[PDB]
Design a protein around this ligand. Structure first.
Ligand SMILES: CCCCCCCCCCCCCCCCCC(=O)OC[C@H](COP(=O)([O-])OCC[N+](C)(C)C)OC(=O)CCCCCCCCCCCCCCCCC
Ligand SMILES: CCCCCCCCCCCCCCCCCC(=O)OC[C@H](COP(=O)(O)OCCN)OC(=O)CCCCCCCCCCCCCCCCC
Ligand SMILES: CCCCCCCCCCCCCCCCCC(=O)OC[C@H](COP(=O)(O)OCCN)OC(=O)CCCCCCCCCCCCCCCCC
Ligand SMILES: CCCCCCCCCCCCCCCCCC(=O)OC[C@H](COP(=O)(O)OCCN)OC(=O)CCCCCCCCCCCCCCCCC
Ligand SMILES: CCCCCCCCCCCCCCCCCC(=O)OC[C@H](COP(=O)(O)OCCN)OC(=O)CCCCCCCCCCCCCCCCC
Ligand SMILES: CCCCCCCCCCCCCCCCCC(=O)OC[C@H](COP(=O)(O)OCCN)OC(=O)CCCCCCCCCCCCCCCCC
Ligand SMILES: CCCCCCCCCCCCCCCCCC(=O)OC[C@H](COP(=O)(O)OCCN)OC(=O)CCCCCCCCCCCCCCCCC
Ligand SMILES: CCCCCCCCCCCCCCCCCC(=O)OC[C@H](COP(=O)(O)OCCN)OC(=O)CCCCCCCCCCCCCCCCC
Ligand SMILES: COC(=O)C1=C(C)NC(C)=C([N+](=O)[O-])[C@H]1c1ccccc1C(F)(F)F
Ligand SMILES: [Ca+2]
Lengths: 819, 169, 233
């Protein structure tokens, strides 16, 4: 039965995931004739094995104590629909509990039934912390119902669904500000409801700043402490040609032969730069073609990838999808370099360990897609005007009122539109649930599922306000739980590979070198030096920096604005020239902070006279007075150390950031190829600011979709209906033939890919620091050793090596942890 | 002189010298922006505007452009001095100020472009022709050379719990 | 209120040893009841409502009730002290970026495409009213019967712009959360020009959102790990 009830499960789950809106009658019957066959085969299987097993020693398994429930509930509706209790959607309950038998897929995977052994102590034991999150949401919903309760009394016909009117509608409006989706528009209604951007009005922004800055914090303590103190214990229980110059030269050619592909105009058939880069294409192919037979002259997976790229780039010195297969021209650089390949196999071995968590998240998304199909099948239609509710009604023309003015009207033809992201089949349901999973556009699906009327009827305002439950369980159980346990899986598969304190401290004491101080001779200049190192002087400089900043925030829209700029310029010039005199330009230019100060001082001086030269008879030169704020972090060591330990790790791992850079390059090129001839028009998401016409615009669009702007609307802004650009070349009659449906794979993949790589770069950098982050600041550590270096260089001003025996009194100047 | 005779920094000061010569030829070549009214074409420059068809002649007519370019050249002959005296008497540190000077050179030269650019918008056609691309490349040369030389002179990011900027060699 | 009186009578004059008031989560309940009584009596003196908005602190009393909830709530506060330097860095980076934006884009987004001789903003169906530039490098108006003129409050009814320090430090924080940052970018593009402004935003997202998120995931994950290993023993 280890491969005989698998077949029954599969033929049941494949008949459950073939229902769609407008299915033919013969399928309607095949799913009714087979729905009882695959239930009788389940009762004889819960019979012909219970008797062979037992009746008291069979219920002992929490695994098999559920397999009986599916039959005990299925046998109801068969002999329940033979009743007059038709109850149209009351039978939809008996149908939505039919797919409850989809859980048998989980049982057939040892991991899938062992991962929950501690997950049962994850949620159920720490449901006390998941309760305080709810107690927080309930307080902020009640505060919203007071602040903006019934204040959205706007005199226009604009609709505002995310308001605080009742409790079920304030909870939805707070959950959305908490998931940070379109929360910036819930703030503009709250600011315009009071006065506008007046004095009282703008102070309602605090409500939307504390709710997001301290609501997400708890969220990073709820669904994270769940997935790093409990996904660790599960793993604990599981435990118990050959010359170098040729390479250095040809590696500079795949970069050039890639940058010649990128910066190429995709629109015009024969452009001026097109043929020049074709010439460079042949001039670089004529060079790469000598390296292959040379590799075959000195000789006879990684050594063969240099061939097909030139083979499919020289054949011509359909016809275009091969040019899409020549975007891997830079994909032949992974062998010439060392770290570039040493990272690729670490991302291909990091995927194998995370392969188990990406299988349960695709079955959970396919289980939630079936529920959506039963709830919202075909209900996502609508008419142009919300007054016609069927497709026979929604015909003809109607009036629209600009500015909500009853005397300024326009004739529009009304048409029966179908929402872009709907729930008709299981594929479209999985698409919609995906775009909800990334938090983009989920309120516009919420307020459309709340209004759904019937199977082929238009919406009804606030019809079923309970449907929000479906969109709030899916968003907590996938986008908040599974996503964080996957990040924890990565963080704990990275944490294994990385006394110990004694070892670090002896290495420190082995490889330390003192500090040069340059305390000066010539007492006439020593008197100048003593006044620029005294604590009072440094605190006065800090105060001057902060006073200049407060002098910089005074400026507004609509002179005393520049006399103080000149005052501070001269004061910071004097404290530089005097410090030079006190250090004699040999110790001054040692400390990098002084180099930075020198840079900023001369920059501000250049600006202060660059403005006077103009005003006698370059906006960025005024930024050098703002950057004086950074120089005050040379005193805050607690921030300096954090910044340093993270910039230290962002520079010791560049071969993983090069992965993201190569991904962006590849996808930018493919995008410029596929949909780059789409016209530029306002009202679409492909416009003068966001398009694939040039290369930087494509990289900017990709960086937009990465941060998660309305990428699901760009995905629809290029899908085989579009008007090609005028100045592009095409055939007559083929205007509305632009863009391809391949976009559905271009974006859906990109996001997912970029969701991984980023996380990659985000955990490496973190695990690389796992000694600093987990460091008890009370016992002993290199901060005390830096204190020791300091007090030593105090008595040892110049480097000078080791110092005289007695001056030992520095041991009288050390505090307990080294005492 | 350990940071004063490295190859990766000698190539940078070579690029700096190439930037110096391109900037010295971009400040005097007054043939870097053409105007095309339409047969009286004028060649622009920071100092002399010339006319051509016959009557070949240059003259003057925005003091900002030339004045700022002079500021940039002043930064050049302020920076190269401290640059060359970095090779004698163990004076390697001097490579740090020099670099920054070069940086600002570029910046000043850069705004020169802008102001002249703006002048080209007030007057016909326009085609940055001969020394405009020269100055556009000289800016990048001087700017990136200054920045790279500055970072190659500054010792290193510690990278170890014991290392530190401003060490004892 | 009778419960608070009963408790204060079962312990001292009011504290007498710091007994009832210094009982941790019991001063909070007295505060709640005291402001409640104050609002009730201030109701019957005028026969406003910013004092009845303190009525929403009642669900906190449940936290005062179950001591397990008091133990949990004091774990999410023990982890917020190591995040003091991350916060001190985010606040200062927002303060710097606000001043930069305040110096570069101070008052550029105030013209737009009205209808000729009208005070009606000319846009297309799904477009938001965006700035304009005439005799400039920004975008030109291309609606049929429209002209570009100033005296227009701002993009989001006047809420998004870098005019004074307040509105700038607000529209910087709105981009730091990676929500509608492209909208600010596109409005600045339409106002001043297309080529320079991206440096301000594309960087504000790298150092501002992503880098800070990395720091926060590092200090927390380290804190959870150091809590687990310093307690499983
Ligand atoms: C506490 C620690 C926190 C540290 C955080 C600090 C990080 C530094 C933040 C970078 C500031 C942003 C740079 C300026 C943005 C340019 C503004 C713009 O594009 O348009 C306005 C304006 C454009 O509007 P405009 O209308 O004035 O343009 C002039 C055109 N005419 C004359 C016709 C009007 O730009 C300028 O005027 C001059 C700037 C042009 C290009 C400037 C870029 C110089 C090179 C980049 C500098 C370094 C960038 C950061 C490097 C890495 C930092 C980590
Ligand atoms: C709960 C504990 C915090 C409660 C404090 C919030 C209550 C103070 C707000 C008072 C108020 O909004 O009314 C005063 C004033 C007038 O309001 P109104 O008459 O409605 O409109 C203008 C008519 N001339 O209001 C105005 O007209 C100007 C706008 C008022 C300013 C709004 C302040 C909102 C700040 C919310 C802080 C709470 C967020 C964090 C809460 C922590 C969790 C408990
Ligand atoms: C499994 C199938 C059980 C789902 C029952 C159901 O009908 O789901 C609807 C529910 C919201 O209620 P709804 O039915 O939409 O209200 C109007 C119609 N009665 O929305 C849902 O319950 C959908 C999500 C069901 C929960 C799946 C498992 C729960 C996981 C944590 C609990
Ligand atoms: C590449 C082949 C492998 C296929 C999947 C492999 C497993 C990856 C897991 C993917 C699961 C994500 C769930 C999202 C489902 C996609 C939506 C869908 O299924 O619908 C197909 C869509 C049609 O939808 P509709 O709106 O009705 O279109 C009407 C006109 N065509 O039109 C479409 O054609 C959309 C096709 C979807 C593209 C699938 C490619 C997945 C890209 C991810 C690959 C790498 C995964 C990264 C994971 C590593 C780290 C997380
Ligand atoms: C180009 C201008 C020069 C760059 C500014 C110089 C600042 C500097 O040199 O700081 C070095 C700092 C680490 O230095 P330190 O604290 O001595 O580390 C040893 C502790 N184990 O490393 C750091 O970066 C500390 C945080 C400062 C970040 C630099 C930002 C300023 C540059 C813009
Ligand atoms: C556990 C986490 C806790 C969560 C932290 C909660 C943060 C609290 C937020 C504090 C907000 C302070 C607001 C007080 C401002 C004073 C009001 C005022 O007078 O300013 C008005 C300001 C400009 O003047 P205005 O009236 O607009 O001009 C019209 C002509 N006179 O008009 C305005 O628009 C003022 C609005 C300013 C809002 C700036 C918001 C930026 C700050 C957010 C950055 C903090 C990041 C925190 C990260 C920490 C990580 C844990
Ligand atoms: C942390 C979260 C809270 C911080 C945000 C503070 C919000 C206040 C922002 C400043 C403000 O509210 O108004 C701007 C003000 C001038 O604005 P305006 O009303 O146009 O001028 C008055 C004309 N009679 O201009 C000002 O006076 C603001 C000056 C403050 C400078 C701040 C820099 C301090 C550095 C730390
Ligand atoms: C810290 C954690 C995360 C770190 C991971 C690292 C990954 C970083 C990924 C972020 C990449 C962001 C790229 C943003 C650059 C976009 C440039 C841009 O948008 O400029 C638009 C502007 C328009 O000009 P144009 O298109 O010519 O048309 C107008 C002509 N009148 O164009 C211009 O006027 C000037 C164009 C030149 C600009 C070139 C500079 C950047 C261009 C691409 C950089 C990257 C190249 C390859 C892709 C790698 C990026 C990852
Ligand atoms: C179809 O893909 C998916 O189910 C995913 C959805 C629903 N959305 C997003 C944004 C994903 N992602 O990659 O960040 C994956 C997901 C999500 C939770 C855990 C794991 C993954 C994984 F699949 F990526 F591993
Ligand atoms: Ca969004």
């Amino acid at each position: 039965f280890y491969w005989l009830v698998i077949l029954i499960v599969a033929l049941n789950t494949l008949s459950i995931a073939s229902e769609h809106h407008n299915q033919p009658l013969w399928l309607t019957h095949l799913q009714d004739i087979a729905n009882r066959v695959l239930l009788s085969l389940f009762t004889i299987e819960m019979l012909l094995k219970m008797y062979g097993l037992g009746l008291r020693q069979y219920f002992m398994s929490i695994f098999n104590r559920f397999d009986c429930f599916v039959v005990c509930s299925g046998i109801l509706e068969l002999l329940l629909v033979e009743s007059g209790a038709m109850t149209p959607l009351g039978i939809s309950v008996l149908r939505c509990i039919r797919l409850l038998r989809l859980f048998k897929i989980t049982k057939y995977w040892t991991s899938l039934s062992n991962l929950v052994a501690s997950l049962l102590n994850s949620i159920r034991s720490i449901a006390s912390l998941l309760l305080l999150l709810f107690l927080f949401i309930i307080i902020f919903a009640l505060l919203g119902m007071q602040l903006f309760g019934g204040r959205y009394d706007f005199e226009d016909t604009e609709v505002r669904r995310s308001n605080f009117d009742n409790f079920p509608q304030a909870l939805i409006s707070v959950f959305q500000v908490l998931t940070g989706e379109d929360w910036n528009s819930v703030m503009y209604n709250g600011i315009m409801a009071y006065g506008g951007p007046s004095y009282p009005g703008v102070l309602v922004c605090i409500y939307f700043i504390i709710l997001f800055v301290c609501g997400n914090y708890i969220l990073l303590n709820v669904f994270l402490a769940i997935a790093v103190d409990n996904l660790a214990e599960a793993e604990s229980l599981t435990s118990a040609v050959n010359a170098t110059w040729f390479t250095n030269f040809i590696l500079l050619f795949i970069l050039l032969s890639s940058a010649a592909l990128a910066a190429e105009d995709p629109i015009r058939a024969e452009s001026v730069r097109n043929q020049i880069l074709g010439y460079f294409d042949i001039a670089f192919t004529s060079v790469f073609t000598v390296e292959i037979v040379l590799k075959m002259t000195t000789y006879g997976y990684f050594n063969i990838l240099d061939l097909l790229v030139v083979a499919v780039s020289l054949i011509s010195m359909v016809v275009k999808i091969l040019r899409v297969l020549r975007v891997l021209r830079p994909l032949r650089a992974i062998n010439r370099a060392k770290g570039l390949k040493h990272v690729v196999q670490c991302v291909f071995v990091a995927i194998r360990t995370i392969g188990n968590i990406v299988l349960v998240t695709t079955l959970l998304q396919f289980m939630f897609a079936c529920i959506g199909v039963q709830l919202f099948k075909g209900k996502f239609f609508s008419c142009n005007d919300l007054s016609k509710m069927t497709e026979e009604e929604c015909r003809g023309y109607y009036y629209v009122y600009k500015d909500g003015d009853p005397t300024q009207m326009e004739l529009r033809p009304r048409q029966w539109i179908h929402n872009d992201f709907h729930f008709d089949n299981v594929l479209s349901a999985m698409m919609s649930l995906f775009t909800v999973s990334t938090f983009e556009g989920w309120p516009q699906l919420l307020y459309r599922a709340i209004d759904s009327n019937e199977e082929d009827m238009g919406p009804v305002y606030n019809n079923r306000v309970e449907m929000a439950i479906f969109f709030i369980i899916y968003i907590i159980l996938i986008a908040f739980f599974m996503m964080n346990i996957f990040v924890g899986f990565v963080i704990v598969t990275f944490q294994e590979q990385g006394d110990k304190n004694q070892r670090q401290c002896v290495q420190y004491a082995l490889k330390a070198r003192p500090l040069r101080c340059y305390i000066p001779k010539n007492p006439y200049q020593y008197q100048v030096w003593y006044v620029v190192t005294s604590s009072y002087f440094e605190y006065l400089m800090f105060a001057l920096i902060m006073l200049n900043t407060i002098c910089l925030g005074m400026q507004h829209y609509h002179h005393i604005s520049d006399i103080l700029n000149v005052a501070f310029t001269i004061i910071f010039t004097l404290e530089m020239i005097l410090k030079l005199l006190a250090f004699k330009a040999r110790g001054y230019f040692g400390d990098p902070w002084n180099v930075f100060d020198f840079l900023i001082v001369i920059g501000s001086i250049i600006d202060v006279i660059l403005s006077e030269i103009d005003t006698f008879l370059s906006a960025f030169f005024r930024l050098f007075r703002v950057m004086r704020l950074i120089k005050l972090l040379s005193r805050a060591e607690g921030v300096r150390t954090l910044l340093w330990t993270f910039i230290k790790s962002f520079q010791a791992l560049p071969y993983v950031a090069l992965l993201i850079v190569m991904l962006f390059f590849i996808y930018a090129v493919i995008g410029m190829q596929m949909f780059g001839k789409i016209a530029l028009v306002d009202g679409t998401q492909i416009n003068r600011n966001n398009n694939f016409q040039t290369f930087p615009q494509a990289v900017l669009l990709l960086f937009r979709c990465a941060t998660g702007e309305a990428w699901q609307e760009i995905l629809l802004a290029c899908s085989y209906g579009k008007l090609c650009d005028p100045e592009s070349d095409y055939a007559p009659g083929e205007e509305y033939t632009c863009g391809t449906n391949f976009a559905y794979y271009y974006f859906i993949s990109f996001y997912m890919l970029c969701a991984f790589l980023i996380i990659n770069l985000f955990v490496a950098v973190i695990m690389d620091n796992f000694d600093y982050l987990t460091r008890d600041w009370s016992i002993l550590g290199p901060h005390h050793l830096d204190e020791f270096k300091a007090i030593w260089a105090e008595y040892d001003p110049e480097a000078k090596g080791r110092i005289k025996h007695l001056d030992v009194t520095l041991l009288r100047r050390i505090q307990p942890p080294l005492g | 002189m350990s940071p004063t005779e490295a190859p990766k920094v000698r190539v940078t000061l070579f690029c700096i010298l190439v930037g110096i010569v391109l900037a010295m030829t971009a400040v005097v070549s007054d043939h870097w922006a053409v105007l095309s009214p339409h047969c009286e074409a004028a060649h622009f420059g920071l100092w002399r505007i010339c006319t051509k068809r016959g009557e070949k002649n240059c003259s003057y007519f925005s003091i900002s452009a030339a004045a700022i370019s002079v500021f940039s050249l002043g930064f050049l002959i302020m920076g190269t001095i401290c640059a060359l005296m970095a090779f004698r008497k163990k004076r390697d540190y001097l490579l740090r100020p020099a670099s920054m000077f070069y940086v600002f050179a570029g910046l000043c030269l850069f705004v020169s472009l802008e102001v002249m650019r703006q002048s080209v918008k007030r007057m016909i056609e326009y085609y940055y022709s001969w020394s405009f691309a020269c100055a556009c490349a000289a800016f990048v040369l001087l700017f990136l050379g200054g920045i790279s030389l500055l970072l190659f002179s500054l010792p290193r990011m510690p990278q170890n719990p014991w290392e530190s900027c401003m060490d004892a060699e | 209120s009778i419960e608070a009186a009963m408790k204060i009578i079962a312990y001292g004059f009011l504290f007498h040893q710091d007994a009832y008031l210094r009982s941790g989560w019991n001063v909070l309940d007295f505060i709640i009841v005291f402001l409640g009584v104050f609002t009730a009596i201030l109701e019957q003196v005028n026969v406003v409502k910013a004092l009845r908005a303190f009525r929403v602190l009642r669900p906190l009393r449940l936290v005062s009730g179950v001591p397990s909830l008091q133990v949990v709530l004091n774990s999410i506060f023990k982890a917020m002290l190591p995040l003091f330097h991350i916060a001190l860095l985010v606040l200062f980076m927002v303060i710097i970026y606000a001043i930069i934006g305040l110096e570069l884009f101070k008052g550029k987004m105030h013209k737009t495409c009205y209808y000729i001789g009208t005070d009606i903003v000319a846009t297309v169906e799904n477009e938001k009213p965006s700035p304009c530039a005439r005799t400039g490098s920004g975008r030109p108006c291309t609606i049929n019967g429209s002209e570009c003129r100033g005296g227009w409050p701002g993009p989001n009814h006047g809420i998004t712009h870098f005019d004074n320090f307040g509105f700038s430090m607000l529209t910087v924080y709105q981009c730091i959360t990676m929500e509608g940052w492209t909208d600010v970018l596109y409005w600045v593009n339409d106002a001043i020009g297309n080529e320079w402004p991206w440096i301000y935003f594309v960087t504000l997202i790298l150092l501002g959102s992503f880098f800070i998120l990395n720091l926060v995931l590092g200090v927390l994950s380290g804190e959870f790990t150091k809590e687990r290993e310093k307690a499983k023993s």
